[PDB]
Design a protein around this ligand. Structure first.
Ligand SMILES: CC(C)S(=O)(=O)NC[C@H](C)c1ccc(-c2ccc([C@@H](C)CNS(=O)(=O)C(C)C)cc2)cc1
Ligand SMILES: N[C@@H](Cn1cc(F)c(=O)[nH]c1=O)C(=O)O
Ligand SMILES: N[C@@H](Cn1cc(F)c(=O)[nH]c1=O)C(=O)O
Ligand SMILES: N[C@@H](Cn1cc(F)c(=O)[nH]c1=O)C(=O)O
Lengths: 46, 153, 146, 85, 51, 51, 85, 51, 51
């Protein structure tokens, strides 16, 4: 999933991940993008 | 009418009653879950029974089931044998048909297929037994090897 | 690419010239000789292998193996006991022992479920029900009476 | 209308595997459960037996935590056994 | 008559639960201790009003 | 014949007997292991009964 | 050993066709016969039903004299019905 | 049926029971006689009289 | 039979007695049921009188 071209969408992707039960994720991104994604993860509690 | 009907009444010696009498001797297998039951049991009646069998002489215990039953037959009904239900029903259903199952059962338990802990076979064997149970395979097998060809009436 | 599989002579016609692992394990089943669970056949002396034995446990073994999909070899226990642990040596004897010390892969027999065993081995849900019972000689028919 | 044992088999293995990917790392404990999910989704000739029995047994007897992929890939080609009894 | 099939009740746990093994052993000890039988008696025959 | 009927008192022993007659109606719980047993059971007598 | 319904199906269709190419122009009349050969060779779960029933019926309802190849090619993908009843 | 399939005979006139297994390998005319599997036992004797 | 011959229907499933007169204009499957011409009367009064 390309996260460089994009908030709600993140919630969507993590929702389908939760249903498919894929916990394991690899973040390959800029430091800034990593921080962003993590923030969005904490906000929706993933 | 009453002569046409016949049937019979079932004799019951119970268990506690067996504990109270010194006339009929009784015992169990030399080494088994049954013996271990009597030994390890913290229940009054069974404790008494165990004390009796433990200090009874000559030893009322037997090496094998066949030996025990054979001892019951030659004892002129003066010796009782405490054995597992199944074996008793089986000996009861085969000639000379001189033995019998009296009273109820002392405890309620079951057999099972044993595997070493963590074996791959454990769960599949388990499910297999469940399926055989629901399919009547277990029952049919029991019949085949017990009552079906049974030799006493 | 192309390769020679043989030759043809003016006489001999077609003559063909020139031209292990990955297997399933045998499961060792330990049982005791008790009727009507495992019994020797009438002619078992002339027979070899699992065709020697017949009984409830034999048929149950066949079924269980057929369901689970393994080749089984029926073997009677060495000492001839079910199972126990010596209070001194703390060593298991019988079928339970052969399971614990890995002399056998599975045990199909009238093996009574006990907590003491349930701690050292796995027991499947019970395939038969029983309990300790009393056996006496069949009483005389006697007489109706006055 | 038409029910094919083969198509039922493919659907069976597939649905089992697709189920086991929800439980990853716990798979060995969930094989039977997921099998019942496949049996109930793809339908069976005998409610007791399930969609593919031999596959269920092979998997339950092989699958280890995070071993799923190779386990399924080795068990899906196995013989289903007898669908009736 | 008799019974149509032979089965039992049991303590149920969700798959992979930790409680599974200890509860099992517990039921076994209660069985061997005679607790189960006496309990059935307490709730079945002991107060039995039909004799 | 009356006192003979007194011992004729027990027409129904097993399940099969009940399966063969439509006179005495019978059933089970709406949802339980019993009904699900009858349904999923391919055994002859129980099959007839479930049908 | 274990017998698979799927493998038995493939074997069924294959053996049927291999039999029917022995008889030419009368194929439509011998279809059932060849089906019993496939059933008896590849084995069946129910002797009555055969290895694949739906295939047999599809063929009997399709095969015409010298129509064999196309008939078989259209009938082998059909659902087997059910090997039990 | 053997003599029919391998062509030793042009037709078969006999008490040849119609079975699906044969109907697939041969042609059967409409039935000329009816039957079914039945039980034969030795008739109980009216004998053993006397005082 | 009419609907079969003149093609109003593709097949006939019914208590159609197999007759030679029809076998010529139509095809009959092996018989799926047995029967025969029988007599029907009113049920006579129950039991019996007599010495
Ligand atoms: C579900 C079936 C596979 S099944 O019920 O387990 N087995 C079928 C077989 C006929 C059978 C049926 C019932 C029983 C059985 C035996 C004993 C008990 C209670 C009294 C004690 N349970 S226990 O497990 O034996 C004990 C040692 C804790 C409960 C059930 C044993 C065997
Ligand atoms: N099966 C038991 C052993 N066993 C066998 C018998 F036939 C018997 O009468 N008593 C007994 O304890 C066990 O598994 O310990
Ligand atoms: N007629 C049968 C053979 N056949 C003959 C008998 F007299 C009999 O009792 N049973 C039987 O199967 C057939 O066509 O195979
Ligand atoms: N089934 C017969 C017609 N048919 C029907 C009846 F109900 C009857 O009693 N008699 C009769 O001839 C036929 O095929 O023509």
């Amino acid at each position: 999933i390309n996260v460089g071209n994009i908030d709600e969408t993140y919630r969507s992707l993590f929702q389908d991940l939760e249903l498919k039960g894929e916990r394991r994720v690899i973040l390959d991104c800029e430091r800034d993008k990593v921080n962003d994604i993590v923030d969005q993860v904490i906000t929706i509690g993933k | 009418a009453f002569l046409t009907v016949e049937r019979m009444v079932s004799p019951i010696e119970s268990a506690e009653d067996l504990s109270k009498q010194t006339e009929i001797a009784y015992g169990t297998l030399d080494s088994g879950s049954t013996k271990e039951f009597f030994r390890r049991s913290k229940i009054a009646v069974f404790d008494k029974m165990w004390t009796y069998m433990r200090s009874a002489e000559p030893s009322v215990f037997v090496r094998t089931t066949a030996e025990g039953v054979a001892r019951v037959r030659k004892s002129k009904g003066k010796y009782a044998y405490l054995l597992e239900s199944t074996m008793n029903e089986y000996i009861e259903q085969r000639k000379p048909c001189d033995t019998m199952k009296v009273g109820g059962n002392l405890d309620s338990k079951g057999y099972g297929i044993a595997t070493p802990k963590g074996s791959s076979l454990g769960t599949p064997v388990n499910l297999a037994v469940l399926k055989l149970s629901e399919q009547g395979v277990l029952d049919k097998l029991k019949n085949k090897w017990w009552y079906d060809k049974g030799e006493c009436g | 690419g192309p390769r020679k599989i043989g030759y043809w002579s003016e006489v001999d016609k077609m003559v063909v010239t020139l031209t292990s692992g990955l297997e399933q394990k045998t499961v060792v089943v330990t049982t005791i000789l008790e009727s009507p669970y495992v019994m020797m056949k009438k002619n078992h002396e002339m027979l070899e292998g699992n065709e020697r034995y017949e009984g409830y446990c034999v048929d149950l073994a066949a079924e269980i193996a057929k369901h689970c999909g393994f080749k089984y070899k029926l073997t009677i226990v060495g000492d001839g006991k079910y199972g126990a642990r010596d209070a001194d040596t703390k060593i298991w004897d019988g079928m339970v022992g052969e399971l614990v010390y890995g002399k056998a892969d599975i045990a199909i027999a009238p093996l009574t479920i006990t907590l003491v065993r349930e701690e050292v081995i796995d027991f499947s849900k019970p395939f038969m029900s029983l309990g300790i019972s009393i056996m006496i000689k069949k009483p005389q028919k006697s007489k109706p009476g006055v | 209308g038409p029910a094919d044992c083969c198509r039922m088999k493919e659907c069976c293995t597939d649905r089992v595997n697709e189920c086991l990917q929800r439980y990853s790392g716990r798979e060995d404990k969930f094989v039977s459960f997921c099998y019942q999910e496949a049996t109930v989704t793809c339908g069976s000739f005998n409610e007791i037996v399930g969609c593919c029995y031999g596959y269920q047994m092979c998997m339950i007897r092989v699958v280890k935590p995070n071993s799923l992929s190779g386990a399924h890939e080795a068990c899906k080609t196995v013989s289903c056994g007898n669908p009736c009894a």
